[PDB]
RNA sequence: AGCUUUGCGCAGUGGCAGUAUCGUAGCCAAUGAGGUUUAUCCGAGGCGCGAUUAUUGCUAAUACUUUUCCCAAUAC
């Protein structure tokens, strides 16, 4: 069903992101960088 | 051999709103949920409960003194 498909997709995404965050918690993958863009150039790296 | 439609995944680029998002070994539901209008007509979720910054994670802001050397005859 549409609800079952959406539920399956959501569970898969949550499992993937939870495993990724556990990997980040255990040094296997360095912590994510802020997603800087042109509009983000001055909120993240203003002084720089 | 291109063109193109539908649904589903993975992404990328955006825009919009935080009075909403999610859960449902709880209950009911196309053998019909819900019906205010269009009712011899429409046609799906609804109720109860639970979590919460009205989804959830991170990142950052909120500091200096241990050590270690010393005075002396060309003489009764």
Short descriptors:
1 chains, 48 residues, mainly alpha, 58% helix, 0% strand, RNA-binding
Précis, in short:
The chain is mainly alpha-helical and 48 residues long. The protein contains two helices and no strands. It is found in: Nucleus; Nucleus speckle.
Task: Write up this protein.
- This protein has helices at 2-25, 41-44.
- The longest helix is centred in the first third of the chain and has 24 residues, at 2-25.
- The protein has 2 helices and no strands.
- With 48 residues, the chain is mainly alpha-helical.
- The structure holds one RNA strand of 76 nucleotides.
What best-fitting shape do the alpha-carbon axes yield? Answer: flat
- Alpha carbon gap, first and last residue: 51 Å
Total helical elements? 2
Major sheet summary line: none
User: What is the radius of gyration computed over CA atoms, rounded to a whole number of angstroms?
Assistant: 17 Å
* Fraction in helix: 55-70%
Q: N-to-C SSE series?
A: HH
Strand tally, please?
A: 0
DSSP strand (E) fraction?
under 5%
Indicate the structural class.
mainly alpha
Organism: Homo sapiens
Protein name: U4/U6 small nuclear ribonucleoprotein Prp3
Function: Plays a role in pre-mRNA splicing as component of the U4/U6-U5 tri-snRNP complex that is involved in spliceosome assembly, and as component of the precatalytic spliceosome (spliceosome B complex).
Subcellular location: Nucleus; Nucleus speckle
């Amino acid at each position: 069903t549409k609800k079952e498909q959406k539920k399956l997709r959501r569970q898969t995404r949550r499992e993937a992101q939870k495993e990724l965050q556990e990997k980040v918690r255990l040094g296997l993958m360095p912590p994510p960088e802020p997603k800087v863009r042109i509009s983000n150039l001055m909120r993240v790296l203003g002084t720089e």
